[PDB]
Subunit: 231 residues, 3 copies
């Protein structure tokens, strides 16, 4: 484990995702509202999945070597197995908050799968220049997601209860800022141009992951928007 | 790229799926009917997924070598990753058109997963004679799907609006004819008996894919069956 | 095939899953109740999936070698591909029986995915002591599932029709007893401590699989709880 300088950030990430999972699990014990139960189930699964994948990276299972640039490059593939399941769950939290229609939910989840799937292909591609073709396709899929979150959901939240509109607006802004950083870290990190070393890259993804999952969840599950209007 | 004679058909397929995706995306911009939005989302995702997998084959990522018959045989595995997601989406288009019940939808999607999954196992199997055992199981799963589309959905469409009944009947006939060709191309192509060479096999799958996805989508999204009855 | 002593139990399992699939398929022909169709579709898919994965193990495709303990250990990875899809389908049978809320269904299916996913990682892990870390995480996920089936569903079934309450109680008890045996067989078998040899381990999993899928299905599909109350 300790033979890799980035191990400290993988261990911290593992701990923070595990602690986040347990807090949400305990906090959700005393909840019977069927609407609130939906948000607790979605939001608790997110850091639980991330916990297992951070642990796999810490123990060395989620790491492979990819030859490109005449070098064997360490690629943590477990990140994409994490994101494949956690990013659509996070979008479902937002879509259920605004009572989005089914067709829009399917478009979001499908574009998200394309985003993560093409990012994985780009991470494992051995022809250096082709890695950035996949990065560009994946980034186009992300821009579609961000467009929908702004010019489809925002207008839908305003016609909703005030507390669900204000909570959505906050979580929307958090998501757009944090998610946009991921393609940048990829491009300048060891998967892309190799400007930033792997140990610093790992620290950046850990800060982003914890903020986008645990921080996101703390804002959502403390809001009254997750409960139905009741007397 | 150009070192493979089949590259021209992979490049054409990539272009036609990309163009198809963009047309459906633009055409769906001016749509607010929640029913129509469902069909546009399903139908636009189909060629978008196929685009990415054709590109992976063009660039050489979606290709592996499988030893059988005393030879290293080029097997494009990316086809099955495509079909795993696009064939159930196409069946969902048909099932939603006739307002199929949930139990029937689950049976269709499950049989479809078995069809594609066993076809993938057959494509990667190293014992030559066993490849055709998997082909037979996969073909049995397809025949179940075709039976349901005829002796379960057809009777349901007649009790529906006339425009949804006539549109379903057309898309049903297109699907049964085109899908039935796939097991035949597999059997006589490089995955099976090896009668037809890979470059011709690739041309045939490209014609079938574009027809079953883009051609299918053009018929559906030009129909009024996708809109609810409104004044 | 016959070069492996466990082949006899893989062949028996294949036959019993295939026969089970055909019986459920025939029995479900004469069913039009939309509620009953749901249970028949879920319950017939379970042994059909298991059939294909037992066949892959029989023919040698679903087997790999994992080095640990200074030895190349035969690991049947196809079991986890089976369980990944069949265990959530079995939980869906139970959840639909008691009309569970959506949030609870998602929590069950998500915990089940974590259970199977971490068990697969543990089966393929090359550092011997780490294999049991994954076993423990997977077992914690199972205990969560069992808790929900007892202290969330049981109370919900009592407020239901008497026949659905008594049928659920029976299937609940069958599930908790049979599922609990799996982590024990893993721990003492070739994936874990290696006390029980592989051929005996394979026999035990076959008895458990057939009972948990075909036996489970025979109890459910003979009950009147799967039909709506009708005159
Ligand atoms: C009902 O809706 C509320 C349940 O949602 C919340 C239910 C959760 C979604 C269930 C998923 C958690 C499982 C219990 C998994 C247990 C293993 C975890 C990874 C444990 C990690 C923390 C600890 C080991 C440090
Ligand atoms: C509606 C939305 C959900 C739609 C989703 C969008 C999606 C279509 C976007 C594209 C996804 C696609 C790129 C997934 C590729 C997975 C692949 C990286 C797995 C590893 O295989 C890659 C190479 C080794 O580098 O295999 C070496 C050769 C091996 C012999 C490969 C044989 C196994 C194949 C991988 C079998 C295909 C399985 C499916 C891809 C499983 C789904 C994985 C997940 C990442 C989507
Ligand atoms: C709301 O419902 C309508 C949206 O459906 C339609 C929405 C679509 C389903 C969203 C999926 C498309 C994404 C925007 C993916 C973008 C990358 C594409 C693969 C681009 C391919 C064409 C071009 C690069 C040649
Ligand atoms: C309700 C419906 C959706 C049900 C679906 C029906 C489905 C059950 C039908 C059978 C599907 C099954 C054959 C999928 C097999 C995937 C497999 C080809 C992936 C590549 O692995 C094959 C060998 C190399 O040749 O791995 C070499 C050895 C490696 C060490 C393998 C270890 C990884 C395992 C593959 C882990 C299992 C992952 C799941 C199979 C992922 C789903 C893939 C998709 C193709 C279903
Ligand atoms: C409508 O709801 C009822 C259909 O459910 C029941 C429908 C089933 C869920 C459909 C799935 C079965 C498919 C027909 C697959 C056929 C291949 C099987 C694996 C055959 C195995 C048995 C035989 C080959 C020994
Ligand atoms: C809501 C719920 C459904 C959530 C589900 C819970 C889930 C997150 C729990 C953890 C699942 C995770 C451990 C799955 C790992 C699959 C992995 C074993 C496949 C084989 O790859 C392992 C190594 C060889 O040993 O690959 C060698 C290196 C290769 C180069 C690997 C590159 C391919 C990657 C495997 C791509 C990721 C694909 C996804 C993991 C596909 C889903 C598989 C299924 C088992 C979940
Ligand atoms: C909890 C994890 C989250 C919210 C991860 C989000 C990840 C992304 C938005 C990743 C995007 C990428 C691109 C847009 C292209 C480059 C490759 C990716 C996958 C890093
Ligand atoms: C857009 C792609 C489509 C509609 C693909 C359809 C593919 C099939 C219907 C494939 C069927 C197969 C068999 C029936 C057995 C032989 C292997 C397959 C997977 C080619
Ligand atoms: C039809 C198959 C069924 C119902 C299989 C159930 C399997 C389990 C409940 C497996 C549980 C495991 C653990 C709890 C940890 C050890 C590894 C597993 C996956 C065997
Ligand atoms: C979206 C965030 C990207 C900003 C990356 C900042 C990295 C600064 C760290 C110093 C770079 C290390 C280079 C010298 C080793
Ligand atoms: C009462 C609110 C705080 C509860 C404690 C939460 C502990 C989980 C770890 C959170 C750290 C990361 C927060 C986002 C920066
Ligand atoms: C379902 C369509 C299958 C028909 C295949 C027709 C192939 C004819 C092309 C000529 C065969 C090439 C053999 C000589 C190289
Ligand atoms: C107005 C209808 C035609 C629009 C142009 C569609 C261009 C997408 C490519 C379609 C070619 C394949 C059609 C099926 C044979
Ligand atoms: C949950 C069931 C686990 C019980 C396992 C009993 C196995 C007894 C078979 C004899 C053990 C073989 C050891 C000598 C070869
Ligand atoms: C009339 C009920 C029996 C029908 C025959 C079922 C045959 C399928 C194989 C069942 C054997 C396994 C039963 C569970 C132990
Ligand atoms: C194995 C991959 C299957 C999933 C394909 C994605 C489409 C799923 C459609 C689900 C239809 C709704 C069923 C109720
Ligand atoms: C990782 C594979 C999980 C999918 C298994 C297929 C069954 C899914 C059941 C979904 C139940 C409906 C939830 C609302
Ligand atoms: C185009 C939709 C408007 C909202 C999206 C904001 C774009 C942020 C740019 C992200 C940069 C990634 C490289
Ligand atoms: C048996 C259901 C009737 C409709 C299915 C038509 C069968 C077409 C044969 C396809 C040939 C594939 C080898
Ligand atoms: C803790 C929830 C109560 C019901 C679960 C029964 C636990 C059975 C123990 C299984 C042993 C697996 C190692
Ligand atoms: C080795 C660098 C080659 C540059 C390729 C950049 C491709 C980016 C595509 C974005 C449209
Ligand atoms: C090398 C050819 C061996 C023939 C096997 C055919 C199997 C087909 C099974 C269809 C029932
Ligand atoms: C080689 C045996 C090492 C023992 C590790 C046991 C780990 C079990 C963790 C359960 C909390
Ligand atoms: C609940 C605390 C979980 C912390 C265990 C993971 C941290 C790795 C320490 C080496
Ligand atoms: C929108 C046009 C997309 C065409 C790019 C793919 C074709 C491959 C050319 C080499
Ligand atoms: C319907 C009977 C299915 C039996 C075939 C599988 C058994 C393997 C025999 C070698
Ligand atoms: C993106 C930063 C999240 C901050 C988490 C703190 C929330 C406390 C209510
Ligand atoms: C299967 C052939 C499809 C033909 C596509 C043309 C549709 C234009 C309305
Ligand atoms: C767990 C044992 C199941 C027994 C199956 C027999 C059911 C006949 C109704
Ligand atoms: C009005 C809410 C502002 C939230 C933005 C937070 C950016 C990290
Ligand atoms: C909408 C604000 C985008 C912020 C992008 C930050 C990328 C590091
Ligand atoms: C009555 C519609 C006929 C459609 C069949 C088209 C076959 C390619
Ligand atoms: C229902 C007509 C089937 C046509 C099969 C064509 C196979 C090449
Ligand atoms: C295995 C075939 C079953 C025969 C019919 C059983 C009575 C519905
Ligand atoms: C009251 C029903 C008892 C069922 C338990 C069966 C254990 C195999
Ligand atoms: C609730 C009874 C548990 C039985 C466990 C059996 C494990 C072999």
């Amino acid at each position: 484990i300790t033979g890799r300088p980035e191990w400290i950030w993988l261990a911290l990430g593992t701990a923070l995702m595990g602690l986040g999972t347990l807090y949400f699990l305990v906090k959700g014990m005393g909840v019977s509202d069927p609407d609130a139960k939906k948000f607790y189930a979605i939001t608790t699964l997110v850091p639980a999945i991330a916990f297992t994948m951070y642990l796999s990276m810490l123990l060395g299972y989620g790491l492979t070597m990819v030859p490109f640039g005449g070098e064997q490059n360490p690629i943590y593939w477990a990140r994409y197995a994490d994101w494949l399941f956690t990013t659509p769950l996070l979008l479902l939290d937002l879509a259920l908050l605004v009572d989005a229609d089914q067709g829009t939910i399917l478009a979001l989840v499908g574009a998200d799968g394309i985003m993560i799937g093409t990012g994985l292909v780009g991470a494992l591609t051995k022809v250096y220049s082709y890695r950035f073709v996949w990065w560009a396709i994946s980034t186009a899929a992300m821009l579609y997601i961000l467009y929908v979150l702004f010019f489809g959901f925002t207008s839908k939240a305003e016609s909703m209860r005030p507390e669900v509109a204000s909570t959505f607006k906050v979580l929307r802004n958090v998501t757009v800022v944090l998610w946009s950083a991921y393609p940048v870290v990829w491009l300048i990190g060891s998967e892309g141009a190799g400007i930033v070393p792997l140990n610093i890259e790992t620290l950046l993804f850990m800060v982003l992951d914890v903020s986008a999952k645990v921080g996101f969840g703390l804002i959502l599950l403390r809001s009254r928007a997750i409960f139905g209007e009741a007397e």
